[PDB]
Amino acid sequence: NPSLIRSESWQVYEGNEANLLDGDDNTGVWYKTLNGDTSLAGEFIGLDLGKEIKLDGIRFVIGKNGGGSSDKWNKFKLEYSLDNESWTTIKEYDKTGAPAGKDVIEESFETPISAKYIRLTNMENINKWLTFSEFAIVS
Ligand SMILES: CC(=O)N[C@@H]1[C@@H](O[C@@H]2O[C@H](CO)[C@@H](O)[C@H](O)[C@H]2NC(C)=O)[C@@H](O)[C@@H](CO)O[C@H]1O
Numbered sequence: 001n002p003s004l005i006r007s008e009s010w011q012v013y014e015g016n017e018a019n020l021l022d023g024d025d026n027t028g029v030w031y032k033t034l035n036g037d038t039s040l041a042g043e044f045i046g047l048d049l050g051k052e053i054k055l056d057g058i059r060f061v062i063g064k065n066g067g068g069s070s071d072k073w074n075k076f077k078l079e080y081s082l083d084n085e086s087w088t089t090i091k092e093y094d095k096t097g098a099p100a101g102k103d104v105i106e107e108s109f110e111t112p113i114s115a116k117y118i119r120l121t122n123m124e125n126i127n128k129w130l131t132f133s134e135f136a137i138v139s
């Protein structure tokens, strides 16, 4: 199965990282950010797929309920890689000001996408910690 990859500096405050791969939207994780409680643009969380595969879509749930429900990136991108070094942006998002809580990011790739790594990546500094609930691919 895909394995979790994320910015090394984050620390788990609540929940467990395996909660991001259990297929349940109601289990997630609350990451403490360093740099003065700030997630820098360019930080990320996503999946190492173990080998190059053809993806038909993703379903990533960001945020969670209760604690840290408001702790989410405002601007971010979905990007993929063959080698964990060079990245291609599938799509960008700006959800500045959106309600706190779980937010399902679900995409279908009309033309399947060949990737070994797929992740969500911060595009703007934010003075928040971070919550997420689930990362899944469709292939
Ligand atoms: C455990 C705790 O309360 N830590 C304080 C920390 O709180 C975090 O601030 C982030 C930025 O406002 C916010 O996104 C987090 O949700 C929040 N965490 C919690 C659990 O409330 C900060 O307030 C810093 C600096 O004041 O102090 C920490 O102790």
Ligand SMILES: [Ca+2]
Binding pocket: 019, 020, 021, 022, 023, 024, 025, 026, 027, 028, 133, 134
């Ligand atoms: Ca979960």
